[PDB]
Design a binder for this molecule. Structure first.
Ligand SMILES: Nc1ncnc2c1ncn2[C@@H]1O[C@H](COP(=O)(O)OP(=O)(O)OP(=O)(O)O)[C@@H](O)[C@H]1O
Ligand SMILES: [Mg+2]
Ligand SMILES: [Zn+2]
Ligand SMILES: [Zn+2]
Ligand SMILES: [Zn+2]
Lengths: 624, 82, 519, 48
């Protein structure tokens, strides 16, 4: 037949038209012509180059564009819309033959090529679907709410004859109903027959639940949902919580026995998938020499310190601390008998309305391994380890808190002052020993909790009391406070000039939202490379200065009658110097980095003190 | 005739992925393992282990779905809690 | 090429029947009923005319009428085959319809003395599906049908039974139970309960004062609360930034008074006026009745969500009386609805995110019965800090002893009892006021360059005056902007002027009160 | 890793690491069985 001949159907329906041998041969030949005769604007072989990159990675799936097939040959597009199931087998055999025609012996490295249609005009919401859409090609949006594991499905099945012990050859599984045999060719029997698990070849299977995105739902109504089945290379692509675009076929579950089941005869529906798309920190040798180049510009430190929370006004000290705790340091083991941690903890104590949660939000978008938990609220993760039951699989699971789940990363605790006793015990253990212990339901174990803590809290009453020390404004205890390196105090001092700029910035935000800076994308990757390969050094020519600095700050602290100074302050000094040095991708901690570090600790100590002590110290420590 | 027959021991275990390198906000996945004879009572829950085995299936919604499991062939423990 | 299914629809009957008056002598007739809708299911296909294949021979029998059940053919058409029981279904070449199920409840005013509400299941077909939302008052016209009911096996009385007659059969056990319940199948669904006047309203340059004086006419005085309720019914603007940060545009109000004050009449006025509003009380409400609940379908294969107070007030006002008797568990859900506009459900293996874009009207009693003027606002209330921070306006009602006010108040109270409803004479009626509010909500104001610099100085005036019972933060600046867009919607214009900023600032400053100190 | 298991590794040897959370009770399975027929009294054996 010819192409304009096919567009006069001479059968009861499309399905019976497509299955006739003469029309199948025609469409197979015309698909070969489409594969090997396309040309872009310039004329490049759009599918030729795709079929040669098929060879290199050796993939088993091919991408086709509906726009091109509508451009060339329209009856094929109509049949693809109406009866895709029959079309896709024919189209997949054509692709496999064409690939072999350009890569010989690829039928061994892979035995079947899958076609996935990329673009398609009509896009539906889950609530619009009706019974006129059954057995048709559809494209939908939604959000992924649940996910199952990977189960194997039968592809090439071998049977045993339990009288003459023979293995009957490959039989194909259609993904509709289970296949059963009835005749043994060697002994001529219809006896018992069982599937040979060892000689069978299987396929990947997974199921997902799609929900209407909350934003689009018209007022007053509720979101609808549907189920999606993914086969082979599509398993484990979209993790729960993301928005996806699905191209597939709309089908009925042939439930079971329609007998019994008294009541109206209703049926259930599913979607069988063809393509999924979404609607990183790995780097390359192109960007490595750009890293090194930016590292040679004097003053990379102040660029980084102004590339942090790029939408909160002022608060330079907290941004410096954020950078320090977002780069890190070097963990240490002295001959397997002494450990000094590497991460630097940061506490925020501030009055209501100073944008602490905004910085905590930024840290989570900027970091690799960051987790969020709340003290007094509703969060998807707690702080205590436990053994609970899985609602879906009905299994017992071991779950750790955010502290365990955020190993070698950062943990973000919001509303740090409203914890119950259990959460406080967990936090203390994690910060002190850096490992979580559990003895529940026969499980005795210790887990690793090498994590960085950033926390936010509100004083007692609601406002800061400058006439008393830090320990008497907040409900936390000295054991916990002493385990933090840097303490930041945000004070709502009524100053006339500052309000001008604060209100200006805030009003500009609303006005603009009506219906130095390094780019964030490069900073994200620079942070990972630096923390992966940069372990700066401490050559001891520079020991004389710090000995005498510590001596002076110890002699002054006891004289003034305030907090004691212990060696944890010097350890913090060195650990922060490591971070300032690592900022410059450096090779030997400089004295400039040490001097920059000294300010942070001295300022923290001076600013966390009573008014009288603070006036004494702010004059005594003027040189550092 | 039971007094004239001989028997052996069989056990079931569940292995879980390290609770640390898990996707954020998803339940950890586990697998079911079977062992017998001279491999029983060699471990206790809470231990981190290395297992060598065969990946197989058994029959227990969907047109044709099977459940995976591992046949144990070796056990090695990182270090035990004394 | 198949034939098109035709549906007939009757409506406008003489009488409408109550749910508690349906009898069994009207079975299979046409009637119209009323009720309130609570639960809806998703649309699923229904078997209408099926194709079967014979199992002895292979013949095709098409277009078998199902009639509410899964009917099979009772005789092979071939004059030779004698098959009457063995058939198989071709699901590929069968014709389906669209099917949905709706649950209805009796209206509040139609319940007898001392009894609880009744329910009824409504079936929809074809093009009538998806016309009823949860929390609606609808009228249904349809047919009264009966469906099998196996729950009646256990009730007292004689339950009818069926058997086959053995008198007449030549010889040389199939008892079926006749238990049914009354259901309803609908063909028409309707939801129940000019520019000259609107353009006349827009012109009058005392419209704001008339609108204020038209709210809660039965209550005497208290103009500040009347203004606040109007601004809450009108609304602000919803904005989104580049970084995906969402700027909120709903106004939340709390009225504080002791059991003596007339603070519940304001709430009862709003629940009678506004389109989508719900009234709930502190100790007669559970958490599931506020957020949501999940139930399973009898049909099998799916689940359904049932709406709560917060979901039934989406784009509306939720009224809560006795806010101080709320639990921390409920308050953590209310806070989630206030910061986010979502409700999260995770129970029985179901995950779902739902929309709650609602405003909160709340009445709270002082902590110790009476209000202590020597304490701050925080000292007198019993709320969690996160909840208190996100409320825009706090209105405190205090009592004063003045003779002329007492004379006026007593006159008003006695007048209402003597003269029934001929004691109000409000400027506008309810039907008039709804139309104006609907028109006003469709304007989207913007700020002007004078407004920016006026706002900056007003914020610096507030902050310098605060250095009281409630301190000033940036949250107050954002509340100021929201109230400004609310007043601009009240005036029905499209740009904010510095005059409206003055009203917003005055309203906010007046809502604040001074702490009394001894000596 | 435990999440890197697919259809390829079926009837093949893999190496895996993890943590143990469950251990059941020991069950009894036969290795040598001796049987008899309740009607005629024929005897035989089975080896597993
Ligand atoms: N310095 C600032 N710069 C910019 N925006 C700010 C600043 N301080 C506060 N804001 C803004 O004011 C609001 C404060 O809300 P936010 O929850 O972040 O404050 P918070 O101090 O974390 O809250 P609370 O302590 O009361 O729980 C946000 O819109 C925030 O962006
Ligand atoms: Mg906060
Ligand atoms: Zn055989
Ligand atoms: Zn027949
Ligand atoms: Zn025998």
């Amino acid at each position: 037949l010819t192409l304009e001949s096919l567009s006069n159907v001479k059968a009861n329906s499309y399905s019976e038209w497509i299955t006739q041998p003469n029309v199948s041969r025609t469409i197979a030949r015309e698909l070969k012509s489409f594969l090997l005769e396309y040309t872009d604007e310039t004329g490049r072989s759009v599918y030729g180059a795709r079929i040669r990159t098929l060879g290199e990675m050796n993939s088993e799936s091919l991408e086709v564009n509906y726009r091109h097939l509508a451009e060339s040959k329209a009856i094929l597009a109509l049949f693809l819309a109406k009866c895709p199931e029959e079309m896709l087998k024919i189209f997949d055999l054509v692709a496999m033959e064409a690939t072999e025609l350009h890569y010989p012996d690829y039928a061994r490295i892979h035995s079947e090529i899958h076609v996935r249609i990329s673009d398609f005009p009509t896009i539906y919401s889950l609530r619009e679907l009706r019974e006129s859409n059954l057995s048709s090609l559809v494209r939908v949006t939604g959000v992924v709410t649940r996910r199952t594991g990977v189960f194997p499905q039968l592809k090439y099945v071998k049977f045993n004859c339990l009288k003459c012990g023979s293995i009957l050859g490959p039989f194909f599984q259609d993904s509709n109903e289970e296949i059963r045999i009835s005749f043994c060719t060697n002994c001529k029997s219809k006896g018992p027959f069982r599937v040979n698990g060892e000689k069978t070849v299987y396929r990947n299977y997974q199921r997902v639940t799609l929900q209407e995105a909350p934003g689009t739902v018209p007022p007053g109504r509720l979101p609808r949902h549907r189920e999606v089945i993914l086969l082979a290379d599509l398993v484990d692509v979209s993790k729960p919580g993301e928005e996806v675009e699905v191209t597939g076929i709309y089908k009925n579950n042939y439930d079971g026995n329609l007998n019994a089941k008294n009541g109206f005869p209703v049926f259930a529906t599913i979607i069988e998938a063809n393509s999924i798309k979404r609607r990183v920190f790995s780097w390359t040798e192109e960007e490595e020499r750009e890293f090194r180049k930016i590292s040679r510009d004097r003053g990379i430190i102040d660029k980084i310190i102004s590339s942090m929370a790029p939408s909160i006004y002022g608060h330079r000290d907290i941004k410096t601390a954020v950078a320090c705790s977002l780069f890190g340091g070097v963990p240490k083991n002295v001959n397997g008998k002494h450990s000094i941690r590497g991460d630097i903890n940061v506490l925020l104590l501030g009055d209501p309305g100073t944008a602490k949660s905004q910085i905590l939000k930024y840290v989570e978008k900027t970091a690799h391994r960051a987790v969020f938990a709340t003290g007094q609220g509703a969060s998807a993760v707690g702080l205590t380890a436990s053994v609970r039951k899985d609602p879906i699989t009905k299994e017992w699971t071991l779950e750790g808190g955010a502290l365990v789940l955020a190993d070698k990363g950062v943990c973000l605790i919001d509303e740090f002052d409203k914890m119950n006793d259990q959460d406080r015990t967990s936090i203390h253990e994690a910060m002190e020993q850096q490992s979580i212990s559990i003895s529940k339901a026969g499980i005795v174990t210790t887990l690793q909790a090498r994590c960085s803590i950033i926390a936010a809290a509100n004083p007692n009453g609601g406002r800061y009391n400058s006439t008393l020390p830090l320990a008497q404004n907040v409900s936390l205890t000295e054991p916990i406070l002493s385990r933090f390196d840097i303490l930041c105090v945000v004070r709502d001092l009524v100053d006339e000039e500052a309000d001008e700029r604060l209100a200006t910035f805030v009003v500009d935000s609303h006005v603009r939202s009506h219906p130095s800076p390094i780019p964030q994308e490069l900073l994200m990757k620079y942070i990972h490379y630096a923390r992966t390969k940069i372990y700066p050094k401490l050559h001891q020519m520079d020991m004389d200065k710090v000995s005498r600095v510590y001596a002076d700050l110890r002699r002054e602290s006891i004289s003034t009658g305030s907090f004691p100074i212990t060696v944890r302050h010097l350890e913090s000094i060195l650990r922060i110097a490591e971070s300032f040095a690592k900022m410059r991708l450096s090779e030997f901690v400089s004295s400039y980095d040490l001097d920059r570090a000294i300010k942070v600790v001295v300022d923290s100590f001076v600013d966390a003190q009573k008014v009288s002590v603070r006036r004494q110290l702010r004059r005594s420590f003027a040189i550092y | 005739i039971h007094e004239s027959s001989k028997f052996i021991d069989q056990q079931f275990l569940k292995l879980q992925e390290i609770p640390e390198l898990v996707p954020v906000g998803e339940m950890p996945r586990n697998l079911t393992m079977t062992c017998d004879r001279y491999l029983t009572n060699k471990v206790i829950p809470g231990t981190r282990v290395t297992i060598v085995g065969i990946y197989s299936i058994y029959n227990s919604s969907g047109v044709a779905i099977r459940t995976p499991y591992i046949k144990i062939l070796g056990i090695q423990s990182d270090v035990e809690t004394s | 090429q198949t034939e098109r299914v035709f549906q007939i629809s009757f409506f406008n009957l003489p009488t409408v029947h109550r749910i508690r008056d349906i009898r069994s002598e009207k079975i299979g007739s046409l009637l119209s009923i009323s009720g309130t809708v609570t639960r809806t299911s998703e649309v699923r296909p229904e078997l209408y005319k099926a194709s079967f294949t014979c199992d002895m021979c292979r013949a095709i029998v098409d277009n078998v009428e199902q009639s509410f059940k899964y009917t099979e053919p009772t005789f092979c058409p071939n004059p030779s085959c004698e098959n009457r029981a063995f058939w198989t279904l071709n699901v590929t070449r069968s014709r389906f319809l669209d099917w949905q199920k709706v649950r209805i409840q009796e209206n509040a005013n139609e319940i007898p003395t001392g009894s609880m509400p009744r329910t009824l299941d409504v079936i929809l077909r074809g093009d009538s599906v998806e016309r009823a939302k949860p929390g609606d008052r609808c009228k249904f016209t349809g047919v009264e049908i009966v469906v099998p009911d196996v729950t009646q096996l256990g009730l007292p009385g004689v339950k009818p039974s069926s058997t086959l007659d053995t008198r007449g059969i030549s010889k040389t056990l199939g008892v079926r139970d006749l238990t049914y319940k009354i259901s309803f199948l609908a063909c028409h669904v309707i939801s129940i309960g000019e520019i000259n006047e609107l353009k006349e309203m827009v012109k009058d340059e005392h419209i704001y004062d008339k609108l204020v004086r038209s709210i809660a006419p039965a209550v005497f005085g208290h103009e500040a609360v009347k203004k606040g309720i109007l601004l809450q019914m009108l609304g602000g603007v919803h904005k989104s930034t580049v970084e995906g940060i969402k700027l909120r545009g709903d106004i939340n109000i709390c009225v504080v008074g002791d059991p003596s004050t007339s603070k519940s009449q304001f709430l009862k006025y709003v629940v009678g006026f506004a389109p989508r509003s719900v009234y709930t009380s502190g100790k007669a409400s559970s958490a599931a009745g506020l957020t949501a609940a999940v139930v399973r379908d009898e049909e099998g294969g799916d689940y359904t969500i049932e709406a709560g107070a917060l979901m039934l007030a989406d784009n509306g006002i939720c009224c809560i009386d006795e806010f101080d008797k709320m639990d921390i568990s409920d308050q953590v859900a209310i806070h989630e609805a206030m910061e986010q506009q979502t409700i999260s459900i995770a129970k029985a293996g179901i995950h779902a995110t739902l929309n709650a874009r609602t405003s909160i009207l709340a009445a709270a009693n002082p902590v110790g019965g009476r209000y202590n003027r020597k304490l701050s606002l925080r000292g007198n209330l019993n709320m969690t800090a996160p909840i208190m921070s996100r409320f825009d306006l706090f209105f405190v009602i205090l009592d004063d002893c003045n003779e002329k006010i007492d004379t006026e108040l007593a006159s008003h109270i006695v007048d209402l009892h003597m003269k029934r409803d001929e004691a109000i004479e409000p400027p506008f009626s309810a039907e008039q006021l709804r139309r104006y509010i609907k028109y006003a909500r469709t304007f989207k104001p913007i700020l002007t360059k004078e407004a920016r610099s006026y706002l900056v100085e007003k914020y610096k005036e507030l902050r310098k005056d605060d250095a009281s019972s409630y301190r000033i933060t940036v949250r107050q600046l954002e509340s100021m902007i929201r109230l400004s867009e609310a007043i601009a919607r009240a005036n029905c214009v499209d740009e904010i002027t510095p005059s409206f900023i003055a009203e917003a600032y005055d309203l906010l400053r007046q809502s604040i009160i001074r702490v009394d100190v001894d000596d | 890793p435990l999440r890197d298991l697919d259809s390829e590794h079926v009837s093949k040897i893999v190496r895996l690491s993890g943590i143990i959370i469950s251990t059941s009770v020991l069950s009894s399975r036969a290795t040598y069985l001796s049987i008899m027929c309740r009607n005629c009294r024929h005897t035989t054996s089975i080896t597993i």
